C-alpha cells in the first residue's frame, strides 16, 4: 500500500509536469498563477498554488547574488 501511495504521488507529479511541457507558455493564456506562503527558509520561501495545488521551494537569492527588487 505504501508503494501504491508513492506510485500515485509521483505519477500525478509527472502528469502535472507535462501540463507544463514545451507548448509555448508565452502566448497561450495558461501562464500566470497566484501565491501564498507557509514557511520561511534561508534562500526562498515555500510557495503554494490554490488553483492547481502544487508545491515547491523557490529562490530569491540567485547564483550571482543578484537579489530581486521590483519597479
Partner RNA sequence: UUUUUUUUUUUUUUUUUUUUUUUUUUCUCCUCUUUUUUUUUUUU
- Residues in contact with RNA by CB under 7 A are 2, 5-6, 9, 41, 43-44, 46, 56-57
- Closer to RNA by CB, 30 or 41: give it: 41
C-alpha 66 chain-centroid distance: 21
In the complex, what is the shortest distance from the CB of residue 42 to RNA, in angstroms, rounded to a whole number? 8
Round to whole Å and give the CA distance between 44 and 28: 28
| Residue placing its CB nearer to RNA in the complex, 2 or 27 | 2
Residues 6+ apart with CB under 8 A from 53: none
What residues have CB less than 8 Å from 20, skipping those under 6 apart?
Answer: none
Nearer to RNA, 30 or 46 (CB): 46
Amino acid at each position: 500500500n505504501q508503494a501504491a501511495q508513492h506510485s500515485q504521488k509521483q505519477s500525478t507529479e509527472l502528469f502535472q509536469c507535462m501540463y507544463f511541457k514545451d507548448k509555448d507558455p508565452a502566448t497561450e493564456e495558461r501562464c500566470i498563477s497566484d501565491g501564498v506562503i507557509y514557511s520561511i527558509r534561508t534562500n526562498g520561501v515555500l510557495l503554494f498554488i490554490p488553483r492547481f495545488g502544487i508545491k515547491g521551494a523557490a529562490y530569491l537569492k540567485n547564483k550571482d547574488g543578484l537579489v530581486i527588487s521590483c519597479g
